[PDB]
Amino acid sequence: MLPLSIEQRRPSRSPEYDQSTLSNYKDFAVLHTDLNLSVSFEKSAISGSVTFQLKKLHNKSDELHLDTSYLDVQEVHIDGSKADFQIEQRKEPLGSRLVINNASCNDNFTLNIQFRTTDKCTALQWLNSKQTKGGKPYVFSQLEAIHARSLFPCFDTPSVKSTFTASIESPLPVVFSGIRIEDTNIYRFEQKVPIPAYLIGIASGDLSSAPIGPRSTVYTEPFRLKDCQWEFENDVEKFIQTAEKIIFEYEWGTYDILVNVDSYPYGGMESPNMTFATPTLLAHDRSNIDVIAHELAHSWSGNLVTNCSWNHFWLNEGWTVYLERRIIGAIHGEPTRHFSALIGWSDLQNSIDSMKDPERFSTLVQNLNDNTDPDDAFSTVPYEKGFNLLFHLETILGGKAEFDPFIRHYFKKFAKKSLDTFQFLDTLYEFYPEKKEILDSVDWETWLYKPGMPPRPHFITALADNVYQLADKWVEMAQHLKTTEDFRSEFNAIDIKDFNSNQLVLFLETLTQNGHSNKKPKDFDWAKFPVASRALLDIYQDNIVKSQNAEVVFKMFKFQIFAKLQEEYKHLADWLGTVGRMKFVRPGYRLLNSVDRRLALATFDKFKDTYHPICKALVKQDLKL
Template structure:
């Protein structure tokens, strides 16, 4: 028997709002961008029915300044609650004179520097450098830091939106037109708050299909148009043939500036995508198949809470691979699934002990955890594997009839896992015994890898391994004439990645490429396309292989190439490798291109200083300023582009010792904040400390004289004894040891995990042992 809640869909534990009391019919959202202050102000109106006659409306907010609130035009007092992990409650009392169930709730607010939904980029960090740039990312629970709302995927409604900005702007709706610098949009399909999106900057668009355009900085427009135009409409049609007609009218893509290392986001009507997708060979556009599939799974049919996130992502990965299968054959679909399976194994292994908490399909967030903590490969790969498994059990032809049925049943709605399972059993009444063979308990609630590994078609991955093996054996036996360009003629870019990764991995075993330079040269002459590749993933591995084998010809090529890419993913390991084989050359190229790597960081630093006026503080309070000057700014301390899992224990040790020195002031500040927190949450301990300190101070002020009170006379030692009699039992009651243990534990966890996960800056490559 499947464990399940009494009522479906389950209540979303990641919202502080009382959304269950209302039906939300529509939302109007008007945004105004102030690039100078780096804030967005908003006016938002919700049309709702008060279905439970609630006396209050409670909305989500996070780091917002709320100016006004009104209900049906009557200005209403409101209260912003204390901040917790999930943000701050905004409670608005419904005036007793309003009896009608229909309410129009209007709020005006403004974002702050802490806003987690917005990224403001200075002009220098864009590709064209023409002006500043803004973009939002509201999933999972960041919409509440852009405007107050019922911030839950369980609430969906149509939106009317606008943004006022000095630069061209897009939002996640159908464009209605521009008047002056006001850009208006309509989203008639009901969407949840996490799909509200805005971007503004030097953006232009070009068509990439009959119902699609690409938006990006003018500089890259032609390249982006070339990248997408061949596949976009094919993807749309393949997806429509699997599910049903695309309902959102237009499907556009916004390519963000190069300095953005994040992935894509399926904002309706306009997917936001990472610029690394633009490879020049159209080999990475698979990402678009994924974001497009979200138009059905996630955007039309939505998880009711982040506990059931796999319904969004598992279904999307499943559809993405089915689209690829339709366009390139079943082997391509399975090749992608095999890579996904390996990713899942790696990511569960990387979780360590926390896999117990975060590697199940259905999460439990009822303790108020931030849903971002639950984010991993698991909902994507474990979820799609479950659907693959069901498809295999039922048979693809029959399962294909279930796909449109499921999306029709739940479109415009939000559901939980149990509703999905009911829908499945309901659609296949004759397959109950087959479906009952699925170990639902393990699939849904147990951590670790899926209980069943589907029988994937391994033909494409086998080709990569076989060819790599052939190179291994023939290099050892000097039979290099056995290779030709035909070997890789039909390889996809992803197959080349797997092939080259396998060759590089040999070097970590007993085989050393530097003893087989002739093999590397032969490979370069028979596989000439690798040197000419425009796909960064392929080219980087090609350079790594050649440089690992000490093929000097490639040292300068790698050095030059490192000057053209901005991603830490390539830059850092690239310099590490070059430094290992030719330190002067590594230093030469690093000095040549250094300014490019630091441009973003520098501009962030200077804007941060201006904003906080640290220079001024320094003049005023020399003590504070010397400490502050040691403090690394938050942009650097929380630079998520530099967060990664250390490859091994040695790297972790290296990072910890570097970061403990470099960020020492920040870590001291964290421990100080934790100490204050420990004291504030242990009132009794704080009271005892204040009592003893006050008592000792008071007694010392007596200067050895007796204290004369109306009821007696006390000398110093009597007073000290009295103080001890009161303080000692209170100290025991305040359990200082457990507070101390908590403080030590939480400090070690916080500081330790930051120091382990934060990569050292690139220049430290040159300080390390060669």
């Protein structure tokens, strides 16, 4: 019942074809996937075999085509018998197609492929005994978006979802994105809800665990175990129950968290039954846990209901950001939800302003070919433009109460399936017959296919106003007060006593933006007011300078750089050797290079090999390499 230009862009058949896979997934049904693996720290390889139970769907070739990337494929059997196969030469950026002749007799058949990972594997990071805080080797995966094919041969598309079983042999503890079949050096798991390959998660190392709720356990290195338990144990069950009330019962069983090694490059990864989390989430006060509301919301938007291709990634991340903000809003109130959206708005702006090819990459729905790296399309746009389209819909349809019935209908309809934007729109229209005119007033063309910032909503700015006022006040007084004594008369620790970490982050951000009002048009620099910038750090030492929150600490370093306080460059350099999260590492190196390149390249050369392959790659070229 949707509008014409949408009708016009929609394919004749949904879900829309995924151009990022070399597999012939439309030709088969994947009924079950079993992983039988062995982890070798000695060789830094995972080897073994994957077994698929498949069903031919109906001049057939007839061939199986699977995705691989830098795998060593060793043998292939169908129904117990050796099957002819050939790997095609690599084509970037999608990899090496594996081609299998299936002379199998029946429509239903079993496919077994023996393989091992290689040194060029893009799915894993390996750490040796000397690299981990705790003294033993460690490995973990990160498969999103198309790295699963570098871990095992598969139909590597989010259109394909399958139950899994897994046996993993390792000389150290293993966690997996499934429920453990309980107790050895052989870890068995089951994932009884069908999942896409990109959600598979594995880690192995010196892991211990501790309960953080009635259905939640945290896993991490022993030295950090109790800190992690304290950080999560007061809040995780509350988050789950909050999400369940907004949507419906959580059906995955356990909700566990793996707090990864310091080289971990993302904030989190929503592997089912084992969220992967950055240790920089641990602040010792519980400031950063919304990253957990985020991964938790994925249980519904992403895991249960999945985007069919990377062109429609907004369905995953936009919904998740929307749901995440509903959780925090339900717990903390609307001003908190709106504050989070306000920070997200400025993240969106920066992302689009910093963009290479904004005309292409800032549209909500993407158009990747088979020549486009799906990475190249990941930005803040699917998150925040996605969120803003949903927030707009919430509003015009009558508010949370009117929208929540749709949310439940949507996640129920597509549970365990994959979909495209067009199917999302059909569902929206089928659900609101009485509201057809309101939905037809939505400029679907601008929201879905046009580049740039969408129309700006009217967020409640209550929790940011105090922050903006102070940053403005600091910008002004920097040009008026001279001696530190002067500053202490105007400012004191009292003025940020009520600032949470998000507010501190926004404050320090606004300062490098030199205020949130054009009183001083010129982007003058803090470098020329050392007494003020030094007084800042002094007066606010308790809450900013002494903070154990990596988010605030990072901003503190950045303010220090924007103010070119040279005596602090050393602490930035060394701190950067302590974290691996891209969000801090990449910008950190950009910051340090703009004030001391001889130190930035010296620092990188020192820590380069401690970072995740991805983070090392991007920092390498950030530093002109």
